[PDB]
Ligand binder design. Structure first.
Ligand SMILES: C/C(=C/[C@@H](O)Cc1ccc(Br)cc1)C(=O)O
Length: 265
């Protein structure tokens, strides 16, 4: 209930069908602004900010409770329950893909379908598992973030966007810089520690994994891994575009996949 204001919950559009948009690391809900109008004619759309977003009062960030993604799940479920929404489709980017997976296990009847964008169950490499990162690489990210956040963010923004799209780089950089540096590092650490591989099979909801041609945080092989192990019906949809944030950088292309995924559930 109090979360509705704290996490800046917005509900827009019209319809039978409820769709939740949950943003990823380094953005707030405004990252959905370019795809949103492709949805609001036929869908009731719920948007909110993760507690770590810069647009949320930093005094509300609990460094203890949110050192596990379960707490982010608690927030999402609390919002949906407050809104008295019994069933929805869920679209999650980055960390929100993990949140969505976990939420669908916690409350199977609540989530009719999952759309996962820039999605991975584990970033650290394991035997025969290519997550894209070794421990030492992960630690260097943390060190970089701690020592010089502005420089790390300046470097990270173009890499994450990937494609040559100035407005997307500018918009991602703005929200990344809007985060408080210590909160940004904390969430980064929390996500890198997370390993959802062992619970993928517990997901029952049908799922669409969105894959782009190149993702700096997600190897091309992860989508196939997710399709293989997610416990429901999973389809991989392919965007002929480059980057980690297609909702920012290629909203038209992504819109068509979203409208395709959200037509039936
Ligand atoms: C929280 C989070 C952290 C990392 O993935 C961000 C990242 C990824 C790759 C590189 Br290089 C530098 C930073 C996420 O993307 O979900």
């Amino acid at each position: 209930a109090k979360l509705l204001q704290i996490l800046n919950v917005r509900v827009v559009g019209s319809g039978e069908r409820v769709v939740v948009l949950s943003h990823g690391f380094g953005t707030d809900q405004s990252a959905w602004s370019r795809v949103l109008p492709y949805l609001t004619r036929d869908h009731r759309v719920v948007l909110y900010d993760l507690v770590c977003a810069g647009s949320v009062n930093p005094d509300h960030f609990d460094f203890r409770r949110y050192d596990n993604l379960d707490a982010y799940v608690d927030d999402l479920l609390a919002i949906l329950d407050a809104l008295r929404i019994p069933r929805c489709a869920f679209v999650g980017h980055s960390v929100s893909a993990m949140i969505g997976i976990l939420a669908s296990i916690r409350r199977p009847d609540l989530f009719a379908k999952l759309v996962l964008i820039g999605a991975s169950p584990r970033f650290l490499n394991d035997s025969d598992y290519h997550g894209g990162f070794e421990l030492e690489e992960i630690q260097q990210v943390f060190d970089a973030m701690g020592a010089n956040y502005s420089a790390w963010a300046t470097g990270y923004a173009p890499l994450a966007v990937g494609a040559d799209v100035p407005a997307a780089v500018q918009e991602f950089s703005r929200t990344l810089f809007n985060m408080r540096p210590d909160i940004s590092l904390h969430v980064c650490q929390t996500v890198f520690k997370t390993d959802l591989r062992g619970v993928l099979g517990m997901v029952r909801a049908p799922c669409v994994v969105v894959q782009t041609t190149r993702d700096v945080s997600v190897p091309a092989s992860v989508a196939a891994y997710l399709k293989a192990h997610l416990g429901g019906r999973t389809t991989v949809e392919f965007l002929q575009t480059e980057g980690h944030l297609p909702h920012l950088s290629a909203p038209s292309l992504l819109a068509q996949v979203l409208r395709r995924a959200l037509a039936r559930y």
